[PDB]
Amino acid sequence: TYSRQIKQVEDDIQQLLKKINELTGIKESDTGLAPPALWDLAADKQTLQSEQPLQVARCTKIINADSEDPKYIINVKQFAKFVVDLSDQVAPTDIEEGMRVGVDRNKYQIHIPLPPKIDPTVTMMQVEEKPDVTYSDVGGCKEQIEKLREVVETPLLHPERFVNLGIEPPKGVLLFGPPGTGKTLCARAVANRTDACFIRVIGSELVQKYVGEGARMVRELFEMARTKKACLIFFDEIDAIGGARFDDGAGGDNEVQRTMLELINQLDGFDPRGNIKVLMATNRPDTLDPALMRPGRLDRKIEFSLPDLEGRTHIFKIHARSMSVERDIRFELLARLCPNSTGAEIRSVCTEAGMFAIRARRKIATEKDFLEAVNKVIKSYAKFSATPRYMTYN
Amino acid sequence: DVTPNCRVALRNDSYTLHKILPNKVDPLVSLMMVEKVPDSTYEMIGGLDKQIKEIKEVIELPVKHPELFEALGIAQPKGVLLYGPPGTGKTLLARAVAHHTDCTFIRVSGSELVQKFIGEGARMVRELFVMAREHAPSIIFMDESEVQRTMLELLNQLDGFEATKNIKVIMATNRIDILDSALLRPGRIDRKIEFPPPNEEARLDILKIHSRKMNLTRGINLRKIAE
Amino acid sequence: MEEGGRDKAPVQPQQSPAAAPGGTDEKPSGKERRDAGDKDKEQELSEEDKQLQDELEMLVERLGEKDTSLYRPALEELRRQIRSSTTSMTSVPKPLKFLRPHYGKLKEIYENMAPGENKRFAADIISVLAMTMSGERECLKYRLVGSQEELASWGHEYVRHLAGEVAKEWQELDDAEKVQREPLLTLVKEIVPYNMAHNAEHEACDLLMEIEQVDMLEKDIDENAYAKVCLYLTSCVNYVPEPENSALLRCALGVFRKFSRFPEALRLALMLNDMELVEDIFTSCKDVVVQKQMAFMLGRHGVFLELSEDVEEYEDLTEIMSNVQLNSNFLALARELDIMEPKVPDDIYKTHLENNRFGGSGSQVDSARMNLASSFVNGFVNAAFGQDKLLTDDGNKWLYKNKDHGMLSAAASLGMILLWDVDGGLTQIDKYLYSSEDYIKSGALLACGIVNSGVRNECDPALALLSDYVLHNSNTMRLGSIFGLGLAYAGSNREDVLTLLLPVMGDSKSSMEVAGVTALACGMIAVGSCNGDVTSTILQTIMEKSETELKDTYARWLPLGLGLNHLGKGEAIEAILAALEVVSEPFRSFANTLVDVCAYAGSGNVLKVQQLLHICSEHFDSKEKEEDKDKKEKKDKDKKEAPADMGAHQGVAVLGIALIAMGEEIGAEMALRTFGHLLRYGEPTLRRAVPLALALISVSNPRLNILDTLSKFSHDADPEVSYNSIFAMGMVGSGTNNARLAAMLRQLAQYHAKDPNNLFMVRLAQGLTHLGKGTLTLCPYHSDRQLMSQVAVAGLLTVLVSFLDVRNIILGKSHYVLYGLVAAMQPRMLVTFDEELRPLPVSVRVGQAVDVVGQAGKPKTITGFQTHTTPVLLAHGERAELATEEFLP
Amino acid sequence: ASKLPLVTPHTQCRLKLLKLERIKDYLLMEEEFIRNQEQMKPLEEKQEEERSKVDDLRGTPMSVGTLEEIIDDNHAIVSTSVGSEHYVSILSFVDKDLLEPGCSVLLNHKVHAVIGVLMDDTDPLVTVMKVEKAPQETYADIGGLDNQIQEIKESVELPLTHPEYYEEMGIKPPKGVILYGPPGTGKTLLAKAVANQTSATFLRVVGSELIQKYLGDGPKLVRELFRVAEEHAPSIVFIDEIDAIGTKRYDSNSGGEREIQRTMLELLNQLDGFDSRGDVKVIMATNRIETLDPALIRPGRIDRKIEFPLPDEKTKKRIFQIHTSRMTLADDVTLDDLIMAKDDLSGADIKAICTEAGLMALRERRMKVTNEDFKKSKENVLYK
Ligand SMILES: Nc1ncnc2c1ncn2[C@@H]1O[C@H](COP(=O)(O)OP(=O)(O)OP(=O)(O)O)[C@@H](O)[C@H]1O
Ligand SMILES: Nc1ncnc2c1ncn2[C@@H]1O[C@H](COP(=O)(O)OP(=O)(O)OP(=O)(O)O)[C@@H](O)[C@H]1O
Ligand SMILES: Nc1ncnc2c1ncn2[C@@H]1O[C@H](COP(=O)(O)OP(=O)(O)O)[C@@H](O)[C@H]1O
Ligand SMILES: [Mg+2]
Ligand SMILES: [Mg+2]
C-alpha cells in the first residue's frame, strides 16, 4: 500500500548509517594497518614509551663460552663475531651454547635467550585442526579399528596400565591395502579423536631440489617433535620417500635414499624419540626396504581388505543412512551384487543412486534405482576398476 | 605521471621523491636485441613469390582486413607451419613479414639468458603472453621435441581461451613426418608451406641480390655460375 | 516501428468519448449505449493479466482525462444508470490515469457513487483493477479520515465492508501467498484500532479455511515478534482465538499465551488457563499443555487444579509439580549414566596438564585462591546426580582450613551437586552441617534452598531456613538464610513467607550485606503486585542511601529487586510509578533506568532506547556517573536477545564501534557484558572478537575489568573447542594475569562451559522465543560484577549459585504412558520459512537422524517420519506425548 | 556494512517498516551518541589529529619486511631484506590479526619496529593460469552429443545453480569428472561452453606443462596450484591431456619417470587428501585413457567417466550446418556428398574443410563458396 513510503524511509536511513559512520571514522581504506577506533592504547604514552626507551635488540646466535669467565662467543647473520657478555637481568644458566640471544647494537651484550629455528614449512604441516570423521563412519573393519586404537591412544590416555604391568608399548605402525579402502579416511578418525600435536607428512613434499635438503627437514621435524612430550607423526604414501636401495652403474635415485637413511636414524638408535609415535600408510608395501620394515619402527602392520558381506552391508548403512529412499528396500541384495568392492565404490553407488531419483522428478530412490547404479558403476566402469593389480600390489 | 616500472631520483635523508628517471628498457627490446635476428625485407627475397602470396593470406589479411573474414563468416587463422630444407629463407621471410606489417617479431629459443626477462622462473611458457598481449599485434616464431610441446601449449591458449587477437605463431622446421600427430590434427594447423631448393632461375636472382654490394668488373654472365 | 493498421482502440475510443460531450446532451442513446460499449470493452479488455498494456487503459485518457474531468463533474444531472456506466469505467484506469498525486483524488471518481457491486468487474482480475486502488484508499485516505475521525461517514462506513469483500477476494481468487496481504489490509487499515477490522475478518477467518490458518497464523506471530505497545497489545489478543474459534489445534495455547500473559492482562492467560480447563478433550494434549505450567515458562499454577474431579485428570497437578520433575531427574538417573556420565569425570583439572613441560618446569603456582576454584573440580562437574562419597574431601579439608567464604563455598557447592532433588538432598547436607560454624551452616542451609529448587513441596516454608534466620546475631546466619528461600520459592508467589521476609527489609538493621540481598531475595518471588515490597525497599533506601554518597552495595542490590518486582510490561506506567518515587540526588536517581527498562526485557519500543542513550552519551563525566552510565548500558542488554535476530546484529554492529572502541570508561571497563547477556549461543563473529580485547589484556586499566571480562567471556555454556583459547590464556595466565587475583578466575572461566556435558538450556528462549523466567535468577550476577571488592569477600555468595534456572537440555522424549517408545527423529538447522511454495521446506540438515535422548544444540529444529504424525503439540515443547495413527496404508 | 541481514517479509508490511524504524532510532542514537564526544571533548580533530599522530609515530622511510615467527606480546623476530633479522616490537595500530609467517610488514627506519602490515601484490602465475573471460558461444554451438552434456551440467552446473536438490535427497554431488575418446572430438570444445556457462573462478592447465627441470618443482607447482584453487572460490579446475605426463620423456627433466611418478603421487594426494577440500571441481580430458594410473581413476577420486564417440552421419550434417551457418554458401554444393567422403571424420575435420574452403574463395576474391571449393578442399584437408 505504502510502496514509496517504505522504500525511501528505508533508503535514507540505509544511507544515514554511512553518512554519520563516516563521521565516526572507519574510512580511509588502507594499505595494511588497523581500525582508527582501536589503536588508541599506543596514543600518547606507548608512542614515546614503546618507542623512545625501547631498543631494537638485534637477535644473534651463540657459538660457545669459555671457562672461569663469561667471555662469550657470539655469531650473527653475515657479519663478524665478538666476545660478548650477559646483562644483569639474566642468569648465566640458560646461556647455553648454540643458542639464539637478543643483543644490543652498541655494547653487544646478551639480553634474553631465544628459541631456535623451526623452518616454517615444517610448521605448516602441523594441522592445528581436526576433521569430523567418526569411528562410526569407518565401520566394517572394527577389528582393525580396535587393533590400531589399542596402540594409538591407550598409553596416551592411560599411561599406567602399561607401566604397572611393566611393558613398554610399541611406537610404530603402518597401514596398507588397495586404494580407497579406508586408509586415509581411517586416519581422519584418529586426527578427529586425538588431542596432542598431530603432525602430518606427505612424502612427496620432501622432494627437494638441493642435496641433503629434505634430510635437514627431517632433523628439524624431529627437533620440534622432541620439544613436545607426546606427538603423533603421520606418514602418507611413503613409496615416494623410499622403496629400497638398488644402485648400479650411474647412481640413480641416490638422493631419496639418503633421506630415507636419515629417517631410519631418527627412528632407531642412540637415545631416540622417546614418546613420539609414528604412523605410516602405503599403497604397495612390496616395494618397501627391509630395514625400514624392521620392527622397532613399523611394529603394527595393519591390512585393509574388502569386507566379507556384513562389513559391506554396514558400509551401505553408513553412506545410506541419510538419504531419501524407498523404505522397503534391502541392502543385502546389493552386497550380494558387490563382491569385490570398496566402500568408496559403495558411496559412489549411493551418490549415483540418488542422482537417478534426481533424474526425472523423484524424491526418494527405489530398489531398481539402486540396480541402475549397480550395472553402471560396477559393470559399466568394469574396464577400469583400478583394483586387481593392486590386490597383488603391483 | 608516476608510472609503474619507472626509475626515480630519490633524496637520501628522508627518501623524499625527487625526480622521474626517464625510462630504462622494454623487457622485450632488451632480450630481443640480445638475440639479434637478422632483419630482412621483400627486396632481398630470391624467387619465393607464391610463398609470399600464401603467407600474406594467412597473416597480412587478419590485420589490415579483419572484417574481410566476417565477410565470409569464417574464423581467422592462427598458426603457420613452414618447412623445407634449411638455408631456404625461412628466417628472413618470417622476420620480413612482421617487419612489413609491423608486427612484434618475437621468436623464442628456450634459452636461459632470455629467462630473466620473462620472470624469475616462468614455470610455464605462458608468462610470455604478458609481454605478447602488451605488444598485441605480434608474431611468435619458433625453430625446429620441446619446441613441439611448446607450440601445443601456445595453441591450447589461443584456441579460444585467449581473447586478444593479432598474436600469431610460426614454426619453422624440416621433415614434417616425424613431428606430433596431435600437432597434425587437421583442426590444429592452419597452413603448411613447403620451401623447395632453388631451380636455375632462383639460383640466378639470389646471385643478383647478393651481387649488389660487391665491387664488380664489367661482364660476368651470372647464369653460367648459377648453372 | 509497426504503427497503424489495427488502430481501432486509439481511434474509436478517441472518437466516442470525444463525441460523448457531443452525445450526452441532445443525444440520449449515444450517452448510455456508447458508455456501455465503453464499459464492457474496457472491462473485458482489461480483466486479463497477460496484457497489462491495455489498448485503452493507457490510451484513452490522453483526451479522456480532460473528457472525464468535464464529464463526471461538469454534468450536474447524474442519474441512476449513467453513474453505473460512468463510474464503472472511470474508476478503473484512475490509478494510471492519474500520477502520484492520485492519493488526494481517488474519491473524485469513486466517492461520487461506488457503482453497484464493484467486484462484479473485479472477479477475474487480481490486483490491477482496484485492489491496488483500495490499497491507495487504506494507505492515505483511510489514514486521514481515521486518524481522529474513525467514527465517520462513507469514508469509514462502506469502507469497512469494501475492506471486507476485497479481503475475502484475497482468499477467494487463488488462495495463493496473497493471503498474507490480508494482514497488510487488516493491519494497514486502522493501525491502532486493529480490533474493529479483526472483528470483520475474524469471523470471516472462522469461515475461511482450516488449512489456511497455519501460514497466516505464523504470519501473525511474525507480526507479533515486535510492535508498538498498542499493536503488540492488540494484535496479540486478537491472535489468541484463531486456534480456538476457527482452528481447534488448541495445544499451542499455554506457551504462546505466555506471550499474551503479561502485557495485555495477567487475568487474560488465567482465563486462558480456564480455557485449558474447559477443553477437557483428552489425557494427551491435556497432559502436554499443562506440563509446561511448572518448570518450563512459569509456575504459580499449583492451586487451580484441585477441583471436585480429583482422580487423575485433576490429579495431573501433582505429576506436573514433581513427578515429571522426577522425570527431569530421571534424565540424569537413567539416560545420562548410559551415554557417558561417570560419577567423577574430574579430569578437566587433569586436562590442565602440560604447562609444567611447556617452557621449563612447574611446581610453582601455590595460591590459596586456587583452592577456591579447586572446589569446582568437585562442584561444577557434579550437577545432575554427580553424587560423591568421600570425593568431597577437597571441600572437606578446605572446609576446616581457612577462607570463611570458602566454608560458605564448599558447603554451597553441595547443592549444585544435588540438583532438582527432594529425596536425599536434605540427608546429605546434615553430615557436614553440624560444625557449629556461621560459615559452614549458612552455606549448607543455603544449599538446602538449592536442592529443593523447583520442588516447592513441604521442605522449608518456615521449617529449616527460618530456623537459620532466627539465630540472627552477626554474619551469614543473618545473611545466607533469606537467599535459598527466594531461590526455591522464586517460582512461587506465596505472600505469607514474603511477609516472613518483609521484616528483614523493614528491620533496618545495619547488616547491609544482608539488607542488600534481601531485595534480591524478595524480588525473585513476585514480579507483579505487592507495592508494599517496593515501599519496604524505598523506605530503607531513604533512611540509609540518602545519608551517604558511597559504594554500589546499595546500587547493585537495592533497586534491582524493584526491577524484579516490576519486570515485564511495556505499558510505561511503572516508569511513572517508580521513576517519580525516589526523586532525589542523581546517585539515588541511579535507579531511574532500573525499573524503566527492567519492565522492558523483550518488546519493540526503541523510542525508549533513544531515551536510554541520548541522555548521557559521554559528557566527559569526571568520575561522577560512570556507574549510572554503566548501568545505562546495563539496560541496553535486554531488547537484543529476542528481537529474533533483529537487534543482535544491531548490537554487535554498534557496541564494537561506540563503546569498546570510542569510549573512555563504559566500553573499556564494563560494556562487554552485553556479550554475556545476549548469548551463550556462541558464534565466531563476537566469539573471535572478544579475545582481541582479552588476549590483548591492556593492563593499564583496572585490569580486573578485562579479567572481569575473562570468565564472563567464558560465560558461554554448551561446551566448545574454546579450550585452545582459554587454555592458551591460562598458559600465559600461569605467569602473567597473576594467580593472586585470578587463580579462581581462570579455572572458574575454564570449568564454566563444561559444567557437565549437558544441562545448559539457560538462555530464556523456549519453544521458539518465550521467556521462562531465566532472568530473575541470571541477571543479578551481571549486576553484581561491575568492578571489584567482590572477587574476595562479598560476591562469593553470588559467584557460585546465582543462576540456577537450568531447565535442563533435551527435547527427545517419548512420554507415552508405557514409556517404551524411544523416538524417530531427525535433528536439523533452524528453519528459514516465511512464505514459500508447496508444503514449505522447513530446514535442510537431513544429514543427521536419531531416535533417542540425544543432544539439543542451539540452532536445531527436529522432526520425524514413519507416519507417526506427532499429533500432540506440533510446534516445540520438549515433552510431546507422541501419539500415533496409521490412516495411511 | 553488514548492519542487518534480514529481508524475509518482502512485502509492504509494517514488519519491514518497523525494522528500519528501530534501526532508524539506533543509527540516530549512534549519531548523537558520538556527537557529544566532540561537543564536550573537542581537544583534537580526531579525523586527522590522532591519525597524523600515528603518522607522526611512523617515519617516511618505511622499510618493507617479512615475518618468520610471532611472540604474542607485540614483539617478534622479523627478517630484513638483507637477511640480518632483528627482534623488534610491534605497535598497537598494527591490527594484529593479518599476521602470518612470511607476510610482508612495515618497519621503522630507525628501530625497525613493526609499524604495519603489507597487502601482497597478488601473483603473476595466478593471473597466468587464471582464465579471465568466457571463451566462446554456448552449448548450442556443439550439436550432436546431447547426452553427456546433461552429464556435465549434472555433475557441474546443477550443483551450482540448484543446491536444493541435493539437500532434499540427502546427498552431495559427484566429485571427479573425466573425458576421453578419439582426438579432435570436441573434448576441449565442451569445456569452452562450460567456461562460457559458469560464474565460478575457472582454471585451465595442460597436462604437458606439469613437468619441470627442477626436482620437486612439479609437485611444488601442484601444491601451490591447489592452494590457488582452494583459496579463491567455487572453482573449476580443468586439466587437458594428462596422458602426456606418461607418454613423452623429455631430457629437460633431470629425473626420469621416477620423478614423474612423484609428481603423480603429489597430485594423487591433492585429489584425495585427508584435509578439508572445499568447493573445487575437477574436470579432466585426454585421448589415451588406457595409459595412465588407474589409482587416480578410482571412485573417490573420479566419479564420472565420459567417452566421446565418433560422430554418426546424421549428426555430421548437423555439424556441417553449424560450421556452415553464417557463411554465404553458394547452392552448388551438397553436404551429403561431403558427409560420406570420410567414414570417420571428426568435427575438427568439417571446420577445417569449411575454413580452408573460405581460404580458397579468398584466393579468388569471391564471396560465395562453390562445389569445387569443397572438391579440392578435401584433397587439401584429408589426403596427404
Ligand atoms: N570402511 C569404509 N567405510 C566407509 N567409507 C569408506 C571406507 N573405506 C573407504 N571409504 C571411502 O573411501 C574414500 C577414500 O578413503 P581413503 O582415502 O582412506 O582410501 P585409502 O584406503 O586411503 O586409499 P588411498 O590412499 O588411495 O586414498 C573415502 O571417501 C571413503 O568414503
Ligand atoms: N561435435 C562438434 N561440433 C562442432 N564442432 C566440433 C565438434 N567436434 C569438434 N569440433 C571442432 O573441432 C575443434 C576441436 O575441438 P576440441 O579441441 O575440443 O576437440 P578435442 O577432442 O578436445 O581435440 P584434442 O583431442 O586435440 O584435444 C573444435 O574447435 C570444434 O569446433
Ligand atoms: N630466397 C633467399 N634469398 C636470399 N637469401 C636466402 C634465401 N634463402 C636462404 N637465403 C640465405 O640463407 C640464410 C637463411 O636461412 P633460412 O632458411 O632463412 O633459415 P634456416 O636456414 O634456419 O631455415 C640467410 O643467410 C640467407 O641469406
Ligand atoms: Mg588414502
Ligand atoms: Mg582438443
Side-chain angles (χ1 to χ4, degrees), chain C residues 377-431:
Chain C
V377 183
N378 191 6
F380 280 166
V381 83
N382 285 318
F385 297 99
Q387 60 183 358
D388 289 334
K389 298 296 182 183
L390 291 174
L391 274 297
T392 62
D393 290 330
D394 58 349
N396 204 173
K397 301 288 103 177
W398 180 58
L399 189 65
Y400 288 160
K401 193 251 286 180
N402 60 357
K403 187 60 70 175
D404 53 352
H405 300 86
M407 296 193 285
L408 186 143
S409 297
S413 66
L414 295 170
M416 293 184 284
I417 298 169
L418 279 82
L419 189 64
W420 292 99
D421 294 332
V422 67
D423 48 354
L426 297 177
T427 67
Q428 300 293 319
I429 295 296
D430 289 331
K431 293 184 286 185

Side-chain angles (χ1 to χ4, degrees), chain C residues 46-211:
Chain C
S46 182
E47 288 293 324
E48 63 272 15
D49 289 330
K50 292 178 71 66
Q51 295 180 359
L52 65 95
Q53 296 87 17
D54 293 323
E55 295 291 325
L56 278 76
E57 199 272 333
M58 292 298 289
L59 274 300
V60 70
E61 71 267 16
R62 296 292 185 268
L63 190 272
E65 184 64 34
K66 300 295 185 290
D67 190 74
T68 302
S69 176
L70 276 74
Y71 181 73
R72 183 72 187 183
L75 193 270
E76 293 293 327
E77 54 98 26
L78 280 305
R79 297 280 79 79
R80 80 281 299 155
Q81 184 179 2
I82 74 171
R83 64 102 183 272
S84 66
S85 297
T86 295
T87 57
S88 175
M89 184 271 291
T90 58
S91 295
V92 173
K94 73 182 180 69
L96 281 78
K97 285 182 179 177
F98 294 109
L99 70 160
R100 297 280 74 77
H102 187 199
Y103 292 165
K105 56 184 179 181
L106 273 73
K107 66 185 181 68
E108 70 178 4
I109 297 173
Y110 185 78
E111 202 185 3
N112 297 113
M113 190 62 206
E117 291 85 5
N118 289 317
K119 66 182 178 68
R120 59 95 175 169
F121 64 99
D124 194 5
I125 184 167
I126 296 95
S127 295
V128 186
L129 210 203
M131 284 67 253
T132 308
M133 188 270 288
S134 294
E136 295 179 353
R137 296 180 62 81
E138 298 296 332
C139 178
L140 191 271
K141 298 181 71 62
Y142 189 73
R143 188 172 66 242
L144 64 88
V145 173
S147 291
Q148 64 184 357
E149 191 62 31
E150 292 87 2
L151 275 301
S153 68
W154 184 263
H156 186 197
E157 295 291 327
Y158 185 74
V159 176
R160 185 261 183 191
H161 185 272
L162 184 70
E165 61 93 18
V166 172
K168 298 297 290 183
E169 192 270 332
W170 294 110
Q171 300 92 21
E172 181 69 29
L173 193 144
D174 195 79
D175 197 1
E177 298 295 327
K178 283 91 170 65
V179 174
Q180 293 179 357
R181 187 65 183 269
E182 191 269 328
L184 276 71
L185 193 277
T186 309
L187 182 63
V188 174
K189 179 174 187 293
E190 53 185 359
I191 299 100
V192 177
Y194 183 76
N195 201 6
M196 188 269 178
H198 187 275
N199 195 5
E201 298 296 323
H202 176 73
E203 294 178 352
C205 187
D206 292 331
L207 56 92
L208 195 147
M209 194 66 204
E210 297 298 321
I211 305 300

Side-chain angles (χ1 to χ4, degrees), chain C residues 519-531:
Chain C
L520 298 174
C522 68
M524 289 174 69
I525 299 170
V527 298
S529 298
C530 191
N531 207 167

Side-chain angles (χ1 to χ4, degrees), chain B residues 185 188, chain D residues 184-189 240:
Chain B
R185 189 175 61 85
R188 183 68 61 187
Chain D
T185 51
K187 305 185 293 293
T188 319
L189 194 277
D240 191 4

Side-chain angles (χ1 to χ4, degrees), chain A residues 137-141 177-188 236-237 282-283 304 307 315 318-319 342-345 347, chain D residues 268 272-273 295 298-301:
Chain A
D137 302 329
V138 201
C141 56
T181 316
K183 300 178 286 187
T184 305
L185 186 275
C186 184
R188 300 180 64 189
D236 187 67
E237 296 170 355
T282 187
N283 197 7
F304 293 98
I315 294 167
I318 293 171
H319 302 296
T342 72
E345 298 178 356
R347 193 266 309 155
Chain D
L268 190 65
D272 194 68
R298 71 169 172 79
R301 294 196 179 102

Side-chain angles (χ1 to χ4, degrees), chain A residues 345-356:
Chain A
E345 298 178 356
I346 296 169
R347 193 266 309 155
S348 71
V349 166
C350 294
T351 56
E352 180 66 35
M355 296 307 294
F356 288 109

